[PDB]
Amino acid sequence: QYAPQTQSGRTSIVHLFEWRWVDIALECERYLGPKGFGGVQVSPPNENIVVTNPSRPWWERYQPVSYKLCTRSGNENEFRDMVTRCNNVGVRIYVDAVINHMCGSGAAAGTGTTCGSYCNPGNREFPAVPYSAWDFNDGKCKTASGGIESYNDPYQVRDCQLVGLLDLALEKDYVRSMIADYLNKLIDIGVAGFRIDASKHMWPGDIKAVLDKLHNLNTNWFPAGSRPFIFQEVIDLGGEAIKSSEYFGNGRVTEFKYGAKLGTVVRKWSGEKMSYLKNWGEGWGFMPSDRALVFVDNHDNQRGHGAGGASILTFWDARLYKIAVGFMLAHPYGFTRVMSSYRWARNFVNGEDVNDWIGPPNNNGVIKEVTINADTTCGNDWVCEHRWREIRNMVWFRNVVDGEPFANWWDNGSNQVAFGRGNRGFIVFNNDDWQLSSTLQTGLPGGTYCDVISGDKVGNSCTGIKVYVSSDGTAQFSISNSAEDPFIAIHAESKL
């Protein structure tokens, strides 16, 4: 449940938000594979309701109507092809399992669905599953509205409707078996694990009862007796009834405090400084390292006021976003997830974006493909953060220093920071508004290394800055506060 099950040596996964299956398969072959990425978290693959008001938002995929692999991203055939093609190049697939609810209770009856299945939310009829009115928690929820009115009461958050969505009676074996059959189908196809959506809104014991019904991973790609990787989405920034630790027995948990606090440090708000990251990790009040799934931003909080609020860094703040992802990829704490998104037109009224519903680039509802430009970037408004040199090369940095301990920390007592990972990688940051000039102990062998942030190592030469480390392991670094990317990272495989 805690092991990623990635092909040995790979240590990160990317969230290819709203990407089509044919696009993800191609990406696995031409990029994710050779570039050393561990896996891909895909959007919900099961059928959802069609929301035309607003026009096809990204959130309609979180309103199920059946368990058929039929969505805007593709059909069952294309899903199987993608999982097969990715596994063959060493890139795993993790599925976003939306199992706490079905569609909204106030949706209209009919076949307004991604695959044509009929459903009647008002009567709780989902014939495709099939589900009926007694498969929901209507009578278990004690609030006057039927929804979650207080987050300080664990009963209503787990038994009431989340934003008006029909809450599944996960205590019944019928529902538990129904879901388990859906997840098992996915495992037989070749999926390596799942992101259990809205786990905070379900009882830990019910999730457990569903996980106990799951098969072992497909032996065509996984060692015998392999258990699926499980990471649960529970938002716990402290001061609340439900805690992340309640779910430690089922699998890993999303550590939302991570990006909330990293963003605050990097934006330099509230008196925070980068030098305070010397004890980053559990020392900052986070869950255990071997239970966490970390990230800077996710699909939800990047486009709104999810967990972390204004402090969350996104691609809109490119310069600082790269600094943050770089620190996350270099630090040993948790299992890392990189974000890959699409651009939308923001419209802030009173500090809040009211266009945060906007879905992926599309042509009359059909998702546009991901085109690749000559400089390896993406077109059609797909930002492809995972394709940025700095994110990409740090993904490589991490695979290289995997298992190495945190070492040789250093800071100017303000916002200039540096640290290594054993004798295989060293990174240095300048988040102060003035020059950085120091002769630091790197812990690496002597020689000339290529900086993987400003360039790459092609042949016996570097396309960017070169850092020379002397026989004793020391090296002179110079970073200007005006520099495009204010940090340098070198490692064992960038050595000349």
> Under DSSP, is residue 64 helix (H, G, I), strand (E, B) or coil?
strand
Report whether 485 belongs to an annotated binding site: no
- Binding part of the chain for Ca ion, among 62-70, 163-171, 188-196, 363-371 by CB under 5 A, reads 163-171
* Cβ-based nearer residue to Ca ion, 160 or 475: 160
Residue 167 binding target from Cl ion, ligand NPO, Ca ion, none, CB below 5 to 8 Å by type: Ca ion
The catalytic residue among 18, 96, 159, 233 is: 233
Tell me the DSSP string of 151-189: TT-HHHHHHSBGGGEEEB-TTSHHHHHHHHHHHHHHHHH
Report whether 319 belongs to an annotated binding site: no
Query: Nearest approach, Cβ of 122 to Ca ion (angstroms)?
Result: 19
Residue 23: left (phi > 0), alpha (psi -120 to 50), or beta? alpha
- Please give the helix or strand (H or E) that residue 77 lies within, else none: helix 76-88
Report whether 337 belongs to an annotated binding site: yes
* Cβ-based nearer residue to Cl ion, 292 or 418: 292
Report whether 195 belongs to an annotated binding site: yes
d(CA 460, CA 147): 63
167 binding Ca ion? (CB under 5 A): yes
298 binding Cl ion? (CB under 5 A): yes
Tell me which DSSP letter residue 405 carries.
P
Residue 201 binding target from Ca ion, Cl ion, ligand NPO, none, CB below 5 to 8 Å by type: Ca ion
- Binding part of the chain for Ca ion, among 21-29, 41-49, 162-170, 227-235 by CB under 5 A, reads 162-170
The catalytic residue among 23, 78, 159, 197 is: 197
Query: Nearest approach, Cβ of 306 to ligand NPO (angstroms)?
Result: 8
200 binding Ca ion? (CB under 5 A): no
Which residue carries 């900052």 as its tokens? 284
Q: How many of the chain's residues bind Ca ion (CB under 5 A)?
A: 4
23 binding Ca ion? (CB under 5 A): no
d(CA 87, CA 25): 10
114 binding Cl ion? (CB under 5 A): no
Furthest C-alpha separation in the chain:
75
Question: Which string of b and e fits 182-211 if b means at least 16 CB within 10 Å?
Answer: bbeebbebbbbbbbbbbbbbbbbebbebbb
201 binding Ca ion? (CB under 5 A): yes
Report whether 433 belongs to an annotated binding site: no
The residue among 340, 102, 79, 336 whose CA lies nearest residue 231 is: 336
Backbone torsions φ then ψ of 97, nearest 5 degrees: -85, 105
Query: Mask 312-351, x = binds Ca ion (CB under 5 A)?
Result: ----------------------------------------
233 binding Ca ion? (CB under 5 A): no
Task: Choose, by CB under 5 A, the member of 5, 161, 254, 311 that binds Cl ion.
Answer: 254
Residue 390 annotated among the catalytic residues of the structure: no
Tell me the DSSP string of 242-296: S-GGGGTTTSEEE-HHHHHHHHHHHTT-TT--GGGGGG-SGGGTPPPGGGEEE-S
Within residues 158-177, the interface with Cl ion by CB under 5 A covers none
* Cβ-based nearer residue to Ca ion, 136 or 194: 136
233 binding Cl ion? (CB under 5 A): yes
Chain center to CA of 263: 16
- Please give the helix or strand (H or E) that residue 487 lies within, else none: strand 487-491
Using CB under 6 A, list all residues that contact ligand NPO.
59, 62-63, 163, 300
CB 60 within 8 A of CB 163: no
CB 18 within 8 A of CB 360: yes
Query: Nearest approach, Cβ of 307 to ligand NPO (angstroms)?
Result: 11
Angle at 163 between CA 293 and CA 355, to 5 degrees: 80
Tell me which DSSP letter residue 62 carries.
G
Which residue carries 């035309």 as its tokens? 52
- 193-196 and 229-232 as β-strands: parallel, antiparallel, unpaired? parallel
Query: Nearest approach, Cβ of 38 to Cl ion (angstroms)?
Result: 17
Residue 233 annotated among the catalytic residues of the structure: yes
Report whether 158 belongs to an annotated binding site: yes
The sign of the torsion formed by the CA atoms of 28, 34, 35, 36 equals: positive
Residue 62 binding target from Ca ion, Cl ion, ligand NPO, none, CB below 5 to 8 Å by type: ligand NPO
Query: Nearest approach, Cβ of 230 to Cl ion (angstroms)?
Result: 13
Q: Whats the size of the chain, residue-wise?
A: 496
Query: Nearest approach, Cβ of 451 to Cl ion (angstroms)?
Result: 32
Query: Nearest approach, Cβ of 9 to Ca ion (angstroms)?
Result: 38
- Binding part of the chain for Ca ion, among 48-56, 98-106, 419-427, 455-463 by CB under 5 A, reads 98-106
Give the residue numbers marked as catalytic: 197, 233
Q: Enumerate binding residues for Ca ion (CB under 5 A).
A: 100, 158, 167, 201
Which residues are annotated as part of the binding site for chloride?
195, 298, 337
The residue ranges that bind Cl ion (CB under 5 A) are 233, 254, 298
Which residues sit in the known binding site for Ca(2+)?
A: 100, 158, 167, 201
